[PDB]
RNA sequence: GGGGACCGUCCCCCGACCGGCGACCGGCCGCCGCCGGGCGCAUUUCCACCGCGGCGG
């Protein structure tokens, strides 16, 4: 991997234009298991008992809630920017 | 004034023709599903409890 190559002057804002990065990069020349079967110990059982996992539910409640839409954005707190304050 | 014939219509048999088994029914084979009873008794399946458990609501 490589650095970001593009400078920020300000935030979303690239040095560099589109046509400037495509030279810098040289795009020029660079250009292009839910079951498991285990036995089951016993004769005349015939060793084949395919198990899977995440089993449908045993129980459905009444009513259900659907769910939300997207939103792009509402980062959780552990990945918020921390800021302090210039005179601290 | 009778009784017949004819015409139009239904009601019937009796055939033969096409279309369809339709939401008008059965019998047979096919496929699928369920139930009951056998066999299958154990790394399968199920039940209940616990963890200051992990995920989604």
Do not use: W
């Not at 089993?55 to 259900?64: C, G, I, Q």
């Not at 659907?66 to 707190?77: A, Q």
């Amino acid at each position: 991997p490589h650095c970001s190559r593009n400078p920020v002057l300000v935030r979303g804002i690239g040095r560099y234009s589109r046509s400037a990065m495509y030279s810098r990069k040289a795009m020029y020349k660079r250009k292009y298991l839910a079951t498991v079967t285990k036995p089951v110990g016993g004769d005349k059982n015939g060793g084949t008992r395919v198990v899977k996992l995440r089993k449908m539910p045993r129980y459905y409640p009444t009513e259900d809630v659907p769910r939300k839409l997207l939103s792009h954005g509402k980062k959780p707190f552990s990945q918020h920017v921390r800021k302090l304050r210039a005179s601290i």
